[PDB]
Amino acid sequence: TNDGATILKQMQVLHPAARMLVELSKAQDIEAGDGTTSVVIIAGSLLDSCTKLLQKGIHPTIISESFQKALEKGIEILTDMSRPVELSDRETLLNSATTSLNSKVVSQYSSLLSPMSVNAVMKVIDPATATSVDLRDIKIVKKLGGTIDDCELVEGLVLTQKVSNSGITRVEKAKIGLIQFCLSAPKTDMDNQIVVSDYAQMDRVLREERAYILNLVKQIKKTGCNVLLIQKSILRDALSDLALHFLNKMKIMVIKDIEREDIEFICKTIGTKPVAHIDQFTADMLGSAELAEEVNLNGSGKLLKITGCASPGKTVTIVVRGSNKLVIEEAERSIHDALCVIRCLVKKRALIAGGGAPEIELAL
Amino acid sequence: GVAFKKTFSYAGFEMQPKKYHNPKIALLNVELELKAEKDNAEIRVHTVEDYQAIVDAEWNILYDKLEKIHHSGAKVVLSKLPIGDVATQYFADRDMFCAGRVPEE
Amino acid sequence: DGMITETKGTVLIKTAEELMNFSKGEENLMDAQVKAIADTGANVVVTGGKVADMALHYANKYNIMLVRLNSKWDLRRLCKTVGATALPRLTPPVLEEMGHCDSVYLSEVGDTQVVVFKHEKEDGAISTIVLRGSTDNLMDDIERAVD
Amino acid sequence: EGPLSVFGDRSTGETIRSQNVMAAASIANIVKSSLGPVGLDKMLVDDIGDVTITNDGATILKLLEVEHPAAKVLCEL
Amino acid sequence: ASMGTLAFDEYGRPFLIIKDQDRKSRLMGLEALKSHIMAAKAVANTMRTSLGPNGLDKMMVDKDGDVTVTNDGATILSMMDVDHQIAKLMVELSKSQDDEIGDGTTGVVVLAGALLEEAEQLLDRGIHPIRIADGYEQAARVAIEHLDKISDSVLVDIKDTEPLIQTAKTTLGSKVVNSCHRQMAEIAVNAVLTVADMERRDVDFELIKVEGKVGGRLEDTKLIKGVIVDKDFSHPQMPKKVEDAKIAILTCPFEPPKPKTKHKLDVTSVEDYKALQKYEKEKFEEMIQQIKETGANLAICQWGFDDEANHLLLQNNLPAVRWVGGPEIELIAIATGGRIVPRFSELTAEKLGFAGLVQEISFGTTKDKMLVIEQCKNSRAVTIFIRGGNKMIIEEAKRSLHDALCVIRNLIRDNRVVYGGGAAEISCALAVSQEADKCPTLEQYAMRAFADALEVIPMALSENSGMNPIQTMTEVRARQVKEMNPALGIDCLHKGTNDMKQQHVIETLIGKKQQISLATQMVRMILKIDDIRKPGESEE
Amino acid sequence: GHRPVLVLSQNTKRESGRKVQSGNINAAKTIADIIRTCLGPKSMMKMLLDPMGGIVMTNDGNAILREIQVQHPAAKSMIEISRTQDEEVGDGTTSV
Amino acid sequence: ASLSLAPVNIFKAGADEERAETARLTSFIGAIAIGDLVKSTLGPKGMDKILLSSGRDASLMVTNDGATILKNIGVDNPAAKVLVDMSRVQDDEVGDGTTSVTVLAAELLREAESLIAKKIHPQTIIAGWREATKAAREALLSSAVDHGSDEVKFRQDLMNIAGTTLSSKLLTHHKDHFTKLAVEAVLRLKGSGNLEAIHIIKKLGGSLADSYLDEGFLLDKKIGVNQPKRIENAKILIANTGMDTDKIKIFGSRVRVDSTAKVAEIEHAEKEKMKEKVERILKHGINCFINRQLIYNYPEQLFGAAGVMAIEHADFAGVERLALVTGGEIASTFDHPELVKLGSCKLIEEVMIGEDKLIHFSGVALGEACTIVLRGATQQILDEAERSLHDALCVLAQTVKDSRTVYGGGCSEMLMAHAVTQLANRTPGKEAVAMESYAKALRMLPTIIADNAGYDSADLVAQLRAAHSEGNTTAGLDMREGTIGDMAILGITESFQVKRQVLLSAAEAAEVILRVDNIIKAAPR
Ligand SMILES: Nc1ncnc2c1ncn2[C@@H]1O[C@H](COP(=O)(O)OP(=O)(O)O)[C@@H](O)[C@H]1O
Ligand SMILES: Nc1ncnc2c1ncn2[C@@H]1O[C@H](COP(=O)(O)OP(=O)(O)O)[C@@H](O)[C@H]1O
Ligand SMILES: [Mg+2]
Ligand SMILES: [Mg+2]
Ligand SMILES: [Mg+2]
Ligand SMILES: [Mg+2]
């Protein structure tokens, strides 16, 4: 890694001043987004100067007030040196992204990553009347294989979950439906048992179980749904073999084991409203999409892609590729740095020259 | 006569009178508590009315034991088995004395 | 004690009346059994197993002496010496199975509490030698000499 | 040990008297079997196989390895 | 002089008698007596500096490092981790004195130590220890008779509590809570007199709830004629103050009924489910309405309750308290004059307790709430609430107030008193010495040793107060002999006078008699032991 | 501490009575039985391994007895009388 | 003879005993060590400490609070334990004065050690100290001034007290801003003393001057999936119901049927029961529904279909604070909509703070509950900001409860010392020396305050003693320049309760420690 915050937090420092510097890096990463190394260098140099200041016989309280005065003056100087910017100027955004990426391993792939980062930021916010960017709306997916040149900016969502309905893929004009109930035998929250005292009852048990499952699948199919997402379930089996077979026979692509924390992102991306009871499963709660397909990444795994959505949400997903895991992690960190730079450009839209110019101007 | 230590009184024991001038003593080997009828007893009901009836039946069994003890004319009740808080308060309300887990000797 | 099933005994209560009457009926049954035993003239009961609390209470009510011989050998020897037969159930004994003895009492020898089944006649099926002594080893040696 | 504060053991009263009598009786019983015409000799192995067969009391008590002072008194006697 | 026996036979064969006799230890006769006397003297000399108003405290630390600062003799000796058996005997003697009396737990140890110290030189002079014990018993009988002679009676009437207050003040004078001397004396006297059967019967200490909370000041300690409960109102929006509350004590959780017997309720249809849910809702509404119908304003439960019942109680304007302990339930029922009701069906108006004010009390910036119930009509239970600057002084105040309560209880049991400050000990020593002169020669030594041992308490008091022991004790004894006044003691507080009757230094006669008796019996036991057989294994 | 106190030193054993006599007689009988078969014109020879690595193939009783080591003192006395017989007259060692 | 110095060994292995001089030595050493450690963190120019834990996590904590310093250390000296418990109890009673009371107790015990070295019985010292405590308490009470009647004067007093409390802490950099912050936050409580109604939210990043008091309220929870994220003219209902597969509370209930169709019917009945409960809630006419417990998927979907915000898993503190800030009633049954009060606020929206999203309540109805956002550069800075602000809020709440105030900067300590000295000049015996030592410690407190700033402490303290002698009863240490001045003019004010508690607790602990002449330790476990 080259990120200052990552370097500082990765190695145990064991010294209280160093731990406070690590916390400082974390704060700079949280608020600004980059500059996590420059802030630590500045703090270290300030304390190093404080050594000679103290040796001269200056109390470490006049030093603090003088440093506060210097900080105020320097903030004024930097503000005076800044230049206004607007989000409609794509060139400045591209320059900022390229400058952020210039010091990372993806400096060579910046020509692809910087426009990707700018588009990712601008596609999840409203350019007018925006004060901050929620980077949780930009999901980053790391898939091993290929090179960094294979990074892609799918507009919809990509799910690492595989299609249980082996045999049917690439549904066109998909009508995606997200359910939060279980497609298995009936079961109540309170304790329930079925007692059999006759062979006719024993046959009727599985007969009526089959009828109930078939009715559930028919109700799902009648709405016009053809792609089904099933939330992950622990207490009760989410998708039984009978339910999967019935869904397969009606040409529906079933995707199960959807994580609970991913529901909000999926609903925002597609427009599908979650359903928890089959009674309320209607056609208007389905998320229309242009194409939902499962693509294999040249033998390095399978990714499920849903590209094209009616009334698309304000979320984008970035697929990061690399030869080995380390470069993938560093590429993810660098892309995050670029996104953070664009975000902190969204608020306080002011630009300054880099290249050490602000520091030397402040010194003079 | 006989004297023995106080044996783990429950709540409401301090409300019982602690001196009687001609008490009739009820010597018992009985667990006066709300508990299962038997360790291998199971109750099976399918109606809320039967549920309420079962609860009232347990309470009425305990109260029948207590009332049978009370109507005997005894004022001091000693048992080799535990005497619950409900029974202790019942005896307190009647100005009676109770003591559970009295040693066999 | 009242005999129990051998597979599994579950008291299935379905109404409040059964719940209220179960304990009363069980106690009445045990009392009837003990009174039926006592009505045959028996005044001493020797059992080879555990003694129920209600059984003990009703035996006390009818003035019946209870002895609990845990070991089966002692039970057989008492049956031999008294003339009774070990009944397998709690049914009252018939005249031929009825046990008779001249005197049964609780006595203390030294500091040991003993129960004595004593015949006035100088006969019977089993005779006992009561060994006294000042040491356990001395009594053991005397017992070896007796053997 | 205690208020006397001497680095060693101490026996007082009937205990030490009994110990002295026991030591003297041990020495006596060592040689009691070698008295009179119906007495018998003794073998004394000297820890390396050397054998001394004797009936004389002085030789037996001199060759023995004694530690109790009240018994050394009898040996020297 | 140890290790049992070691002879290994005259014939050289092994001689083993006792199991593992080569590692055991034993002691015989006179040196065993000397070791016991030395251990008892060490314990007594350690304890004698905590005697009188000028006595100092001991900082006691347990295994876990928790620290307690105390002056109580029984507490000090209980906290000690001793190994000598005689030390354990001394600790048990202090525990006995605390159990029977509650005061004088330090005087008994000093008296026993002095008795054994005199017995040491008596034995060195060649006297059988049984003779010493018999002489000690005779002198103790004489001293107890003299104590009965010079005793004085006090009134234990509720109308005039001045002698009781003086006795409580004398008891508390040696504790750290003497900064609020008369206040603690008054609260202790009132607490004991409130909860007591006036026909010279017992005082049930379970009706006195002594509870302390940090913060505030020691002067903030007050007597509450009611109950202090660590709980608060269940709903945060329930009112914090109820006036003229009609208490409703219940031991049934505000939940749907549940049979004790193993039960199963079968739901076989949708109608069954609807009936079940309607039954639950109706049970909640019915229980709340049953509580309300009696006219109660407050509800006290023992086993807690759930959300629906909580909101129904709040909605119906019934403040409620849950998870109240059984002892607290009983105390509240006793104080408010209300019955304890096991289920809602039996609740009625006549079983409702009445309290003048029920309030929730805050304790600064601590978030910890606490409930107060007081202003009852004829409360037969009382609560003592102790405040302080740290938990150590709180515990010390707890035990000091317990000592005061025990002293007033002893006064109720028997109202005869004797005058303290060493006056009683000096008079008893004089009586013993006078009785010795008429006694035959051989027991005179034991009688005079007992008198000298009795003299230790005034000397200890004078030493703790900085005065010269021998001169002051001799002068006070001479004054007692010259003019007949058994009330002359050691002016520990330097008030100018030596008459303890004017200084109002009063102790219970039972306390002195118990001190002398217990010390004599324990000294007799210690003198009668002439053999010890410890395992001597020094095991881990 | 408190080391044991006793009359005789440690490692000092003592046995008495019929046991000692029986042991002495058994030791003498064992000594006799060692060379019982080396007597007469039809005696067999014995091979003895010297601790210094030598070999003594001999029929004489005295050499056999003096080349072996024993711990029982009665056996030592028997070996001594064998040597005495050998020195005094020259032969008759395995007969005595 | 003593237990330890006896020919017989009377103790278990590992247990010891310390007699008079040794016990006094250990107690005094521990007390002086505690006092020297806690001091130098006193007064406006005090410095902070670093508490580096030895545990596996090795928690790092920078602090200026005396109570936190004393509680988070390994103490083995029993007298040091007594002082630590004193500091903790002082913190519990009031939020300030922990360092002051600890230092005062240490100085008192140092003077006690000197007096014992001068051959004075400790009971005489204790009696003299009791008299001195009475005199000092009476003088301090007579010196108190109350301004609760006048609202503007009381506001000025609150500002001065908050500034004085925050002067010694890390917030002294922005003392003015943080003083306004704390005063407004306390005044919003409308007289209630529950500091738990004030929530302190620490968000990493930003300057320390970026901290602010939200005009409404902030919640750190999240909204459902298909529910509105912005509501105007909200009608909030606060509840504490199940909403998680709500089971009938009959423990022994079970389903025993002979067909799976009946099982499906029972499941539909359960879902219909949940739907009916949701409809009963919606009958209240609400916009935002806040439940203390979890809300599963079916009720969340039902709320979303009705366009009702549903905030879930707002803990007990959350629902209490929302009820305080909006005026709603925390309900658990919904059969009487007319008997349930509904909270109201102008706007509910999601606000972006740092890299986290929070729910913002704006234009609340009551507002008797505050949220304070703290921004900092390090976690330690945020922790100290929270601790210092807690101290300020505690002192302000105490002042609101009891409006009597005294002058700080050493003025109060010097006036009590003057009263004690005047009493001492009126008493014969060594008790006069004890009272003189009491006054000496009382004067040593502002001496340490002056030492912490590097000033000429001896000269300043002598000047203060003189000025109080001629009758200047408001003179104190002017820490801006290093002179003496009028604390009435300079506005250096303190709560009377805090100073009274400090004095009384210090005297109490010194008295209880001095009474000990023997320390006995059991064998450690
Ligand atoms: N004000 C006083 N003046 C003189 N002597 C007192 C005074 N108060 C208590 N004493 C004496 O101090 C002795 C010790 O009392 P204390 O320490 O309170 O309890 P204990 O008897 O358990 O030691 C008592 O025997 C009493 O006579
Ligand atoms: N501006 C100030 N000028 C003079 N003295 C002050 C000022 N602010 C605080 N002090 C004094 O500093 C003392 C210590 O306060 P502080 O260091 O905050 O810790 P604590 O309040 O816990 O003792 C207080 O007694 C107060 O009188
Ligand atoms: Mg950068
Ligand atoms: Mg006392
Ligand atoms: Mg030959
Ligand atoms: Mg402060």
Side-chain angles (χ1 to χ4, degrees), chain B:
Chain B
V2 56
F4 49 92
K5 209 171 80 193
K6 169 189 169 177
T7 60
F8 184 31
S9 296
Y10 272 95
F13 178 81
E14 301 311 311
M15 317 162 93
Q16 295 170 359
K18 303 197 181 308
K19 192 184 181 69
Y20 309 84
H21 264 299
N22 259 335
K24 285 154 83 172
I25 300 158
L27 297 174
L28 298 161
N29 181 4
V30 171
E31 182 167 359
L32 300 157
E33 279 190 346
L34 268 183
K35 61 180 163 42
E37 198 59 33
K38 272 200 73 179
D39 63 358
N40 65 303
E42 181 181 358
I43 287 165
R44 277 192 204 155
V45 289
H46 59 264
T47 309
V48 297
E49 275 84 4
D50 294 357
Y51 194 73
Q52 199 46 67
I54 285 302
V55 181
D56 297 351
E58 293 210 312
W59 277 99
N60 291 334
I61 287 165
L62 179 57
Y63 279 159
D64 204 349
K65 281 176 188 165
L66 295 183
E67 183 263 302
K68 277 186 184 300
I69 287 166
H70 165 65
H71 275 61
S72 69
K75 298 309 273 284
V76 175
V77 177
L78 310 165
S79 175
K80 209 191 296 177
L81 297 182
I83 287 181
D85 52 327
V86 176
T88 292
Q89 293 143 18
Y90 182 102
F91 292 147
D93 297 2
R94 313 305 201 282
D95 289 306
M96 293 177 70
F97 189 93
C98 80
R101 306 166 212 267
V102 174
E104 170 151 333
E105 292 84 3

Side-chain angles (χ1 to χ4, degrees), chain E residues 43 90 116 120 127 129 172 227 253 371 436:
Chain E
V43 174
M90 296 267 99
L116 284 169
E120 184 165 53
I127 300 173
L172 293 164
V227 176
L371 183 63

Side-chain angles (χ1 to χ4, degrees), chain E residues 146-373:
Chain E
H146 184 70
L147 275 177
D148 284 334
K149 185 181 292 294
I150 67 171
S151 56
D152 196 357
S153 296
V154 305
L155 184 60
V156 181
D157 191 22
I158 184 68
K159 298 179 180 66
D160 191 7
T161 58
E162 197 57 34
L164 272 61
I165 284 165
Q166 287 163 1
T167 317
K169 271 181 87 159
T170 299
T171 297
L172 293 164
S174 55
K175 309 293 180 275
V176 76
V177 299
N178 46 26
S179 59
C180 311
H181 201 193
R182 197 197 160 77
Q183 173 190 2
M184 311 273 138
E186 279 185 356
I187 70 182
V189 164
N190 290 327
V192 172
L193 283 184
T194 302
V195 298
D197 217 355
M198 294 299 291
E199 44 266 22
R200 307 283 70 72
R201 276 203 74 220
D202 58 350
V203 166
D204 208 348
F205 278 129
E206 293 179 353
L207 301 188
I208 301 159
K209 194 181 188 293
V210 181
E211 183 178 1
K213 189 77 158 58
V214 301
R217 298 137 282 282
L218 204 66
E219 61 180 5
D220 288 336
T221 297
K222 73 189 157 185
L223 187 81
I224 296 159
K225 284 198 166 91
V227 176
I228 295 297
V229 179
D230 210 355
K231 318 280 157 178
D232 49 357
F233 294 111
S234 48
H235 201 285
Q237 291 185 310
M238 270 185 218
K240 307 302 183 185
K241 174 204 216 305
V242 192
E243 294 179 353
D244 305 307
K246 286 191 253 302
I247 301 299
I249 302 106
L250 295 146
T251 59
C252 49
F254 299 1
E255 304 165 1
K258 180 183 176 182
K260 296 287 177 167
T261 301
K262 294 181 176 67
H263 64 291
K264 291 284 162 221
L265 174 56
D266 292 329
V267 175
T268 71
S269 66
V270 185
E271 288 78 7
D272 290 12
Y273 198 82
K274 306 286 180 63
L276 186 54
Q277 67 152 359
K278 184 193 83 153
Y279 164 81
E280 180 204 42
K281 165 193 186 229
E282 270 197 289
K283 283 314 284 186
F284 273 129
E285 287 171 359
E286 185 194 354
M287 80 165 42
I288 294 306
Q289 193 271 330
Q290 282 186 297
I291 298 186
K292 172 104 184 151
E293 196 272 333
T294 70
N297 316 320
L298 189 69
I300 308 292
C301 184
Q302 173 177 5
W303 295 102
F305 58 88
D306 60 358
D307 311 334
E308 293 94 314
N310 210 15
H311 181 231
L312 278 168
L313 284 161
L314 169 75
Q315 178 169 112
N316 290 270
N317 309 131
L318 280 72
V321 188
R322 56 173 158 192
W323 292 115
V324 191
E328 283 80 6
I329 283 294
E330 185 179 32
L331 276 192
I332 289 165
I334 289 168
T336 66
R339 296 280 93 188
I340 294 174
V341 182
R343 46 178 187 162
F344 310 97
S345 175
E346 307 166 30
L347 185 51
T348 183
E350 304 88 51
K351 302 184 178 176
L352 297 185
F354 179 83
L357 165 64
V358 185
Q359 202 168 20
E360 188 177 288
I361 299 300
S362 299
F363 298 123
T365 72
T366 189
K367 183 194 90 73
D368 291 336
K369 302 291 189 309
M370 185 180 288
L371 183 63
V372 64
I373 303 154

Side-chain angles (χ1 to χ4, degrees), chain D residues 12-19:
Chain D
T12 316
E14 262 182 45
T15 306
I16 184 50
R17 302 199 171 269
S18 296
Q19 278 196 4

Side-chain angles (χ1 to χ4, degrees), chain G residues 95-97 164-166 168-169 391:
Chain G
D96 207 40
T164 311
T165 299
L166 295 173
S168 75
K169 304 312 176 86
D391 275 10

Side-chain angles (χ1 to χ4, degrees), chain D residues 1 3-4 13-14 22 29 35 37 39 43 56 59-60 67 71 74:
Chain D
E1 190 76 27
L4 180 54
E14 262 182 45
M22 183 272 296
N29 292 312
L35 191 80
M43 283 214 200
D56 187 74
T59 312
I60 293 167
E67 313 191 335
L74 284 196

Side-chain angles (χ1 to χ4, degrees), chain A residues 18-38:
Chain A
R19 302 176 63 168
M20 293 177 71
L21 259 62
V22 169
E23 289 293 340
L24 168 61
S25 283
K26 290 179 185 179
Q28 173 77 4
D29 201 326
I30 282 173
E31 197 64 31
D34 67 336
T36 65
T37 309
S38 305

